[PDB]
Structures are given as structure tokens and as C-alpha cells.
């Protein structure tokens, strides 16, 4: 936000904000879609107590 | 990391220009300074001068300041020395070296060139004379035999001999070059091979007179008068 003689205006940046969002987007991906597969567990509920 | 390859003619006519080049491998030429250094065999060595490997701003030893002219190239990753009005004494081995960026600092000559011999061509350049030398009874130890290969009549120096193209290395001794009364240069590269192999294998001494581009895989064989 500037305040000049001409008036009062704003202008957005793209350079820094692109690097901002970029680093956030990675952090998503490093924590999103990443998974482990588990194919045969042991039972986790017990109807009877042996 | 950083390696250098020294290049140039090891021979040059008296009172003529010397032109040498050395290579860089790894690093960026723009990011250091480079100098040259002179050493005749078995005496004191000397710093020649340095240049801005980045910009081209230079210095030279006062003695060789007028005589020596060093250069660079950003393009080819190379750099040159041009020396005018050479002396007969100037015959030496040369080096390319990495110097620190600071005009005044320590840790100079951190890395050195492989070393290229530069001999002034006092006499006419010529081909090597490869002289085989047969092992005898009087040149064989109990465990070893003395096969020889003399490179005589060769001008100029050096001459580097390979044995079986460097297949055998054990007890291979390149005897230093000799100034004979002939005014001509010569040497043998003696090979010690076990006495058990005598009269069996016909060994080869291989001549690499690099400036003359000569290859002589000449054998050594026994002959009777």
C-alpha cells in the first residue's frame, strides 16, 4: 500500500507470494496422498475373551 | 575435484617464443586465480606470475615480467603462457597451479599441474635409437634377470618407455637420461624379471617419443656372432 501525491493505491506482488504458496503446496503433498499399505493385521475386536 | 593437464612442445628453437597451455577439470575457471611456476631439474624453483582467472588482471615476477606473458580463456576453460627471447638456461619443467583469490594471502599453489618438461632445442630434433639389451649369465641374479632397452641418439628429451605397454611394473626402473660425449641424449629403462623366465618369453620394450610420435615395440633377442 502506497500513499503518494497522486492518491492512495495498492498493488500485489507475484514473486514472493508464488514462493510462499509453492512451499505450502509441497508441505501438503509430503503429507497428502502418501500412505502405507497393510494387507493382513491381527484381529482388533474380540467377541469372546479366550 | 580439480585436476590440470599441461600441454605444449617440449622443444623450442633458441631465442624463440614459448607457447604453453594447461587444462582445468572441475570447478569454475572464473572463480579463482592462476599462475605458472618454473623449475630446472635439481635446483631452486620460481614463481612466474598470476592472472585474474575471473577478470584478467595480472602480475608477473619482476625478472620475467617483460619476458613472460600469461593469458587465460573463459571460453575453453584454458589459460596460456607466452615467453619471448628464451635462454638456453630457461630449459626446465613447468607447472600450472591454483592460487588464492587474494592478491596477498597464504595457501598459494594449493594444487599443481602434472608437470611438462620444456627443453630448448639446442640441436636438431631427431628420432629415438632403440637399443635392445639381451640378458646374459653375467646379468642374471639368482631370482632375477636384467633385460635392457637403451634409447640413444634421441634428441630432444624426454623418452618414456612402456614395458609390455605397462603390463609388467615390478622392478621396472627407468634410469635417468644421459648426456654422452656425443652431445646426444640417451638412457635405458631396465626391467628386472625372474631368472625362471629366461629363454622362454621374448619381451618387448615400447618407446613413446611423444613429440616425434614414435612407437617402437622392439623386442630383445639373443643372437650369435
Amino acid at each position: 500500500r502506497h500513499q503518494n501525491s497522486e492518491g492512495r493505491g495498492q498493488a500485489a506482488d507475484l514473486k514472493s507470494t508464488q514462493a510462499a504458496i509453492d512451499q505450502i503446496n509441497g508441505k501438503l503433498n509430503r503429507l497428502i496422498g502418501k500412505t502405507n499399505e497393510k494387507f493382513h493385521q491381527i484381529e482388533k475386536e474380540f467377541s469372546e475373551v479366550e | 575435484q580439480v585436476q590440470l593437464q599441461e600441454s605444449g612442445p617440449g622443444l623450442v628453437k633458441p631465442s624463440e617464443t614459448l607457447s604453453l597451455t594447461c587444462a582445468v577439470s572441475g570447478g569454475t575457471f572464473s572463480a579463482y586465480y592462476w599462475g605458472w611456476i618454473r623449475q630446472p631439474p635439481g635446483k631452486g624453483l620460481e614463481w612466474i606470475g598470476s592472472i585474474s582467472g575471473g577478470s584478467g588482471s595480472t602480475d608477473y615476477s619482476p625478472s620475467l615480467k617483460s619476458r613472460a606473458t600469461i593469458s587465460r580463456d573463459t571460453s575453453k576453460n584454458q589459460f596460456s603462457l607466452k615467453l619471448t627471447s628464451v635462454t638456453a638456461a630457461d630449459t626446465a619443467v613447468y607447472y600450472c597451479v591454483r592460487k588464492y583469490w587474494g592478491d596477498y594471502y597464504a595457501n598459494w599453489f594449493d594444487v599443481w599441474g602434472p608437470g611438462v618438461l620444456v627443453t630448448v632445442s639446442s640441436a636438431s630434433t631427431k628420432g629415438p635409437s632403440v637399443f635392445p639389451l639381451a640378458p646374459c649369465s653375467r646379468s642374471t641374479s639368482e631370482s632375477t634377470a636384467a633385460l635392457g632397452c637403451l634409447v640413444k641418439d634421441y634428441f630432444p628429451e624426454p623418452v618414456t618407455v612402456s614395458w609390455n605397454s605397462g603390463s609388467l611394473t615390478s622392478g621396472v626402473h627407468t634410469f635417468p637420461a644421459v648426456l654422452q660425449s656425443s652431445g646426444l641424449y640417451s638412457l635405458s629403462s631396465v626391467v628386472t624379471v625372474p631368472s625362471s623366465s629366461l629363454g622362454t618369453q621374448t619381451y618387448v620394450c615400447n618407446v613413446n617419443h611423444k613429440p616425434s610420435n614414435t612407437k617402437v615395440d622392439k623386442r630383445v633377442e639373443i643372437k650369435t656372432c
Binding site: 512451499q23 509441497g26 509430503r30 | 575435484q1 580439480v2 572441475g26 570447478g27 569454475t28
Partner: protein, 43 residues
């Protein structure tokens, strides 16, 4: 004229990638290993 002092840090012609939390890939001077993956091959 007028003098200029100018600060900075060293680098290496050849470096290695390293996984962080800030950036999944980055180049630093000198790396090492934390996982011995190789054996002599005998007890």
C-alpha cells in the same frame, strides 16, 4: 578512492542433495551417511 568491504561464505564445486522439512531437496557443501547398508559378509 573509497574502500568497500564485502562479506560472504564458502561453497563447494560439487555438493549433495539433502531432505529437510523446509524443502524436500536442497544443496549443501558436505554430506554424510546415517545408514550403513553394507556388510563385510561374515560373522
Amino acid at each position: 578512492s573509497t574502500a568497500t568491504l564485502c562479506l560472504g561464505h564458502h561453497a563447494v564445486p560439487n555438493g549433495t542433495i539433502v531432505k529437510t522439512i523446509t524443502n524436500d531437496q536442497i544443496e549443501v557443501t558436505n554430506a554424510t551417511e546415517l545408514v550403513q547398508n553394507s556388510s563385510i559378509g561374515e560373522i
